[PDB]
Scaffold this active site. Sequence first.
Site, PDB file in Angstrom:
ATOM      1  N   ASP A  45       0.839  -1.190   0.000  1.00  0.00           N
ATOM      2  CA  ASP A  45       0.000   0.000   0.000  1.00  0.00           C
ATOM      3  C   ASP A  45       0.877   1.244   0.000  1.00  0.00           C
ATOM      4  OD1 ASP A  45      -2.028   1.817   0.144  1.00  0.00           O
ATOM      5  OD2 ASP A  45      -2.769   1.200   2.114  1.00  0.00           O
ATOM      6  N   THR A  78      -5.865   6.802  -3.877  1.00  0.00           N
ATOM      7  CA  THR A  78      -4.829   7.732  -3.437  1.00  0.00           C
ATOM      8  C   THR A  78      -3.582   7.628  -4.304  1.00  0.00           C
ATOM      9  OG1 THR A  78      -3.953   6.146  -1.847  1.00  0.00           O
ATOM     10  CG2 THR A  78      -5.715   7.590  -1.119  1.00  0.00           C
ATOM     11  N   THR A  79      -3.157   6.404  -4.618  1.00  0.00           N
ATOM     12  CA  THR A  79      -1.991   6.233  -5.473  1.00  0.00           C
ATOM     13  C   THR A  79      -2.224   6.864  -6.835  1.00  0.00           C
ATOM     14  OG1 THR A  79      -2.551   4.159  -6.577  1.00  0.00           O
ATOM     15  CG2 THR A  79      -1.801   4.033  -4.299  1.00  0.00           C
ATOM     16  N   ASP A 352     -17.034   1.302   1.094  1.00  0.00           N
ATOM     17  CA  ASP A 352     -16.642   1.847  -0.195  1.00  0.00           C
ATOM     18  C   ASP A 352     -17.715   1.545  -1.237  1.00  0.00           C
ATOM     19  OD1 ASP A 352     -14.276   2.928   0.745  1.00  0.00           O
ATOM     20  OD2 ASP A 352     -13.147   1.073   0.358  1.00  0.00           O
TER      21      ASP A 352
HETATM   22  N1  LIG Z   1      -8.048  -6.848 -12.908  1.00  0.00           N
HETATM   23  C1  LIG Z   1      -7.586  -5.639 -13.305  1.00  0.00           C
HETATM   24  N2  LIG Z   1      -7.104  -5.451 -14.550  1.00  0.00           N
HETATM   25  C2  LIG Z   1      -6.644  -4.257 -14.954  1.00  0.00           C
HETATM   26  N3  LIG Z   1      -6.621  -3.167 -14.174  1.00  0.00           N
HETATM   27  C3  LIG Z   1      -7.075  -3.214 -12.904  1.00  0.00           C
HETATM   28  C4  LIG Z   1      -7.593  -4.482 -12.387  1.00  0.00           C
HETATM   29  N4  LIG Z   1      -7.970  -4.254 -11.118  1.00  0.00           N
HETATM   30  C5  LIG Z   1      -7.714  -2.950 -10.846  1.00  0.00           C
HETATM   31  N5  LIG Z   1      -7.182  -2.334 -11.913  1.00  0.00           N
HETATM   32  C6  LIG Z   1      -6.771  -0.914 -11.983  1.00  0.00           C
HETATM   33  O1  LIG Z   1      -6.267  -0.473 -10.725  1.00  0.00           O
HETATM   34  C7  LIG Z   1      -6.506   0.927 -10.607  1.00  0.00           C
HETATM   35  C8  LIG Z   1      -6.779   1.334  -9.166  1.00  0.00           C
HETATM   36  O2  LIG Z   1      -5.940   0.624  -8.262  1.00  0.00           O
HETATM   37  P1  LIG Z   1      -5.273   1.425  -7.042  1.00  0.00           P
HETATM   38  O3  LIG Z   1      -5.548   2.892  -7.249  1.00  0.00           O
HETATM   39  O4  LIG Z   1      -3.848   0.975  -6.872  1.00  0.00           O
HETATM   40  O5  LIG Z   1      -6.122   0.955  -5.769  1.00  0.00           O
HETATM   41  P2  LIG Z   1      -6.529   2.064  -4.685  1.00  0.00           P
HETATM   42  O6  LIG Z   1      -7.550   2.876  -5.435  1.00  0.00           O
HETATM   43  O7  LIG Z   1      -7.073   1.267  -3.528  1.00  0.00           O
HETATM   44  O8  LIG Z   1      -5.243   2.794  -4.399  1.00  0.00           O
HETATM   45  C9  LIG Z   1      -7.689   1.243 -11.504  1.00  0.00           C
HETATM   46  O9  LIG Z   1      -7.342   2.292 -12.407  1.00  0.00           O
HETATM   47  C10 LIG Z   1      -7.954  -0.018 -12.294  1.00  0.00           C
HETATM   48  O10 LIG Z   1      -7.998   0.286 -13.686  1.00  0.00           O
END
Ligand SMILES: Nc1ncnc2c1ncn2[C@@H]1O[C@H](COP(=O)(O)OP(=O)(O)O)[C@@H](O)[C@H]1O
Lengths: 485, 508, 508
Positions: A45, A78-79, A352
């Site tokens: 994370d 956030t990322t 969420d």
């Molecule tokens: N199975 C998947 N295949 C392709 N992209 C994915 C998949 N699952 C999630 N993503 C991508 O991950 C991104 C968001 O992940 P991330 O921002 O790291 O999680 P969080 O929002 O919890 O920080 C999204 O833009 C989405 O497009």
Amino acid sequence: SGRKVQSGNINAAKTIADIIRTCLGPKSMMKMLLDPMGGIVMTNDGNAILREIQVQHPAAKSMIEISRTQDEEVGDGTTSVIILAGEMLSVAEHFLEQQMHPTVVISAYRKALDDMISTLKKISIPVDISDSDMMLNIINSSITTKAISRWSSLACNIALDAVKMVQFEENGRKEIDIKKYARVEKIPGGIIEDSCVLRGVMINKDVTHPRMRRYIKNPRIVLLDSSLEYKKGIQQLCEDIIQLKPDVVITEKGISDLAQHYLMRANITAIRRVRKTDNNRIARACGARIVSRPEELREDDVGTGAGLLEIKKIGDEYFTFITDCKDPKACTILLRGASKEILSEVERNLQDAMQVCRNVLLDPQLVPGGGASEMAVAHALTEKSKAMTGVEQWPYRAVAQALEVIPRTLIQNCGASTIRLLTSLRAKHTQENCETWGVNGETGTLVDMKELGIWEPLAVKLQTYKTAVETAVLLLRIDDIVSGH
Amino acid sequence: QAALAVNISAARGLQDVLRTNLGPKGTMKMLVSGAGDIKLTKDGNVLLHEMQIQHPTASLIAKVATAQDDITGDGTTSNVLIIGELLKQADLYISEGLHPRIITEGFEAAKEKALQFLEEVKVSREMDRETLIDVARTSLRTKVHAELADVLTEAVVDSILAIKKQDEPIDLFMIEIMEMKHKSETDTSLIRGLVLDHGARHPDMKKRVEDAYILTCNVSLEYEKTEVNSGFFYKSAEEREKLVKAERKFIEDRVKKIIELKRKVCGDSDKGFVVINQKGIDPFSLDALSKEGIVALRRAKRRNMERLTLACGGVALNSFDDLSPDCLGHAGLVYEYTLGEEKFTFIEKCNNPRSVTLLIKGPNKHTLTQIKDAVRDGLRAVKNAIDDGCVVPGAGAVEVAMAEALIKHKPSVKGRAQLGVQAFADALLIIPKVLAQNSGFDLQETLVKIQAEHSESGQLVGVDLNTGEPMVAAEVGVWDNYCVKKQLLHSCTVIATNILLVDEIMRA
Amino acid sequence: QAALAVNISAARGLQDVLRTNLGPKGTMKMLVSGAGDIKLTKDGNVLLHEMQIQHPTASLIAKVATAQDDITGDGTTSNVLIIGELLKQADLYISEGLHPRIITEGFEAAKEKALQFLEEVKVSREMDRETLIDVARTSLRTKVHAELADVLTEAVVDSILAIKKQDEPIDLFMIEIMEMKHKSETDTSLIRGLVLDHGARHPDMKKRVEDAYILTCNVSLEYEKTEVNSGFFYKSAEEREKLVKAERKFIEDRVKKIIELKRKVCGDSDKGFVVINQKGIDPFSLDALSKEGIVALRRAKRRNMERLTLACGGVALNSFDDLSPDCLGHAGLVYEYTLGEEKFTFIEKCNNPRSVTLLIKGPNKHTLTQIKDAVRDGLRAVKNAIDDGCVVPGAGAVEVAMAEALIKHKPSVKGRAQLGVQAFADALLIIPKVLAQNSGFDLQETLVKIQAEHSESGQLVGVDLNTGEPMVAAEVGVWDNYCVKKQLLHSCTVIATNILLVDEIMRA
Ligand SMILES: Nc1ncnc2c1ncn2[C@@H]1O[C@H](COP(=O)(O)OP(=O)(O)O)[C@@H](O)[C@H]1O
Ligand SMILES: Nc1ncnc2c1ncn2[C@@H]1O[C@H](COP(=O)(O)OP(=O)(O)O)[C@@H](O)[C@H]1O
Ligand SMILES: Nc1ncnc2c1ncn2[C@@H]1O[C@H](COP(=O)(O)OP(=O)(O)O)[C@@H](O)[C@H]1O
């Protein structure tokens, strides 16, 4: 200095963005934490990455703070916010060295943000509300790739019942939702299937000796911050309470057995050692009122709340059940299991999805993930900038060319080449008008996201884009840091 | 952006340190404390607590390896070696770009193939005394001196056979080891029933007592009609004389109950009722109980009464006021052994034919520590063997076959995961190579011979650590635990993937 | 112990330097002289000859590589890369024991197997224009611009096809490359016959000579006088000023002898009397003979004179007389060309049509040199292809197939030579990897695709150096020389073995 401070701010932005630029997507890479004692931490994370690391530049601190405020407001992303802000501030370097003012860059960025908002609202696929079909589809899309895949069958229906427990009907149609008023009941022990739902507030505190009329068929709760003493020689407050004739009066001080008898003479049930985070939800679910000034005391001092009270000592511990509350806005959700290491994460992802649901009530829209939305809006901007002229067209195009960082990093931390795949993705995204393809995060291959089955809520994407643009403009608006060092 | 190089280098250093420890011919390590105390050991389970580790990621590897091998207790050194070799094999391909994620995919595919292959090379039999003897020998020669382990093998296997009630696994409390300081090692015998740590040294202790009983005593000579044990109230005259009378009547008023109970159970303690006390007893009371055949004893340990409660029957609770004759703890036979200086109580034929104890014995701590952890490892290994019904050949025989199976399965997987499974199969071969090297033989010649033998004949052939020759590892009886190998694969793959997935080490 | 490591490092460094030149898509290197002259080229031979190498053993490797490459056509960069990868693979095992003799035996066994496999792989396709076009394209696109290579292919293949009429291996002397600095480089074709370097100062002797006879014999219109009497014009000045005369009489006598030969064998003033001198001639007698139809020329080097002897004929000596017309030769056209300021003598349609020259008109010096070397390499490649009459698929193809044959042949050999065989195979893998890398693709991805396609196809498959996907070299038209592959295997094995066998470095 002049533009030197702008360059320094955006350089700090860039050097803090690429720290966590690699840890997004379903194949996030791990990071190393080296505290000055010798310990080492595995971390996926980026939020914890930024939290644990220490920074000295005010720009970096401000961006970390905005990432946090986005985290506890809307949830995830956030990322993505950090990456996007860093990318726009990095591509602003080229123009800030053109000896051209930050104000026109700012105006171009604002126009780009407005156009991106429009094209997201145009490209978003609709979803139904109160229908379990695409609710479970969204569960498969976003609520997955978490620690819930083993317990999705319970998380899904927990959320799907929980969607109708925190509604406020103030100004429109169920558009208001509050976040902490959901009565969370996280208790280990037993099987996880014992987790359930209830319409009412669940209070973990109870009277020491419940040898009195605790439950009444129409609780008219009255809140009071006063302390109950022995007697007047204070029974005077109890006598004044008798004037309006309630059945339950909630306090925040201990009650004695003789105090219990003095209270049941007025037939009112008090409580002790309760929390404000419990009292507020009790008042919200019951619509009660708190008042002790004699002049203000009128017929409005008693507000009817629940309609059924019950107490159950499940496992020799003092629960209190307040069911059938007047306002179904603070109601019980139950959590059961063995350890709170995952159930907390499952919970948070469920609320969420709750925010997803309330935005679906506002805008029942989903945006194709896996870089599909990013490249779609980049194409929209690039084709839009052709018609518009002026010196600000270059930043307008550069914002579009910068927002494609999300698919680029999705491809990068998968093994496949980030150049050929991006070029192919753009190629099948410009001339191909009605497709909006994306990149598979697992195998690193282009795939139409309508087929893969990944989608994101419209509201979270909108919030991420808006926060990124506002962070970029804020860091471009700072002309001096100096008030000291 | 290449901190993977640093992590790989530290893992390889840890591999080099923990090498030269495998098999019965492993070189022992010399653990010296900062104060000056010394320690000799060979197993990685305790070796990965070697005061200083220097490199922090090496400490991380040590921590996770120990925390995850606490469930089987035999794959530590093998785990570290295979982790290091996996990282090296990965590095040979990471050096030429080749992003590590697909290497991780290859590792996972190879792990799945290896786990599938393990299920058909395991041999499941109605294992008997000889098989457990061989298992204990294999697990013991690799942690202590070769000749010494031979005598401990029998005392382990017979103890486990006695302890084995049914399909239910054994319990940690149900077998207990004891410490004593005899000059000579004098092997290690098996005692049925609980053994007491300490006892009173009155001359008139009854040695041969049959069909005895027992009760625990907490406080008997300090405070009158009070269970509190503390300083005496000298200042209070009424309390001062009360505590003086507590010396005599506070013990007499229940010694009378004890003697009447023992008489009404058997005439004048015909069966010899016995007693146990948490602390010392009155010298006059000690003399009376010795003359009455009651055998007063002191220095009771907190781990004794709860173990003997279900072992000796009844409940031997600390408190007094026995009253109802149900809490008395039956003992079929009790003995007092006073070898050299210390005296011990042997509680035999209690209300349980189980809950036996060992008798490890030898010189000062520098040797008995090795004795105790080696016998503990042997007991845990034979416990795993008693739990599962299948056992696997050792001497690296299983891993040569695993590498062959993975190599043959390599073309099945598409992409660069093919290269990943190639690296994994190559790295699984470290244990046979290290085993051959530790015995002084040529590292590659022995492996080549073993591979040729396994290729021409389907027998799972292994390395022989006395002649450097391919050995069948089935007739010789060098079996290893199945669950240990499974957990070894699961641990090594996850640790290697996690280390390969890191980058940008940061100073928090 | 350490000298081996030093040699490994130096060979790896040389391989890394030369890596980005293999393949038609490779990037050229620039050689700047100490004086300031710049040479831009990619041919392996010239790079190894002209590089300012620092490491001594790297210089040794370069020297032996170019010395052995002088035998066959080309293939130097591939040879160096294979040597480097062989050394790296060998060191990968030598680091864990493996006395280098074992690796050497593995190398020789793998070499024998690879030579056998190449014997069963060669293609014996017959003689035709199109295959030799493809061979020239393959040999030229790896040295020069693509379109320029396409232009040069036709000229080179036509020249060699014309020379092939003798049905014997012939080259080098019979094909010459002329040097001139025209602004337009597009002008490049074959000139059947012979082109002289330069003519003489002559006002309109004949222009289009048409049919004529050639006798040469180094006409002495500026016959060597008696200038050298004593040092220089000393006090005895009348010697070098007056005795220097009386030699013009010899010049006039030679003029009448040329006149007699002309109107004796020619029969008229026509039928030009072609003669060439190695030194100058006075313009007076030059024009006097020109008015009689005599084709007088001067100031040519030896090589053109021996070329004329084998093509047209004629003795060569400064001082001569009225010799027999036996050495006289005849040419169909002796047309003289002039471009701006320099004059060209086109001696065409002569007897013995074997002598043929090629025309190149590069703008600057370095482009001219690069075109000359590319033409020479193409001529050598086509000569080899015609001589052996057998060609092998390029773009790797044979490398991966030999690798598969070696790998399947690994269990056949006994002892530890399997290690050497595996190292040799992984070393032969370098060529397709280098091609894929220089194209711009990924090493392992392209290699896996090629090997997988070869797995179930059996047919030779190579890398398509524009898209990266596997391609069958037979259909596309990429061909290599069988003799080149033979020499490659022999030389790489020999040099790698020699480097591996060393153990100590000492000064001398
Ligand atoms: N199975 C998947 N295949 C392709 N992209 C994915 C998949 N699952 C999630 N993503 C991508 O991950 C991104 C968001 O992940 P991330 O921002 O790291 O999680 P969080 O929002 O919890 O920080 C999204 O833009 C989405 O497009
Ligand atoms: N007599 C023997 N012959 C061959 N191999 C043996 C023998 N005894 C032990 N081994 C080897 O020792 C290894 C187990 O020791 P090890 O894993 O080092 O224990 P730990 O990891 O608990 O220190 C097994 O792989 C087994 O093959
Ligand atoms: N069109 C092509 N496509 C793929 N590979 C080619 C092509 N042309 C040549 N090659 C490869 O280039 C190699 C020769 O390159 P190089 O070593 O530079 O030539 P040399 O060293 O003989 O001068 C051959 O092995 C051949 O396989």
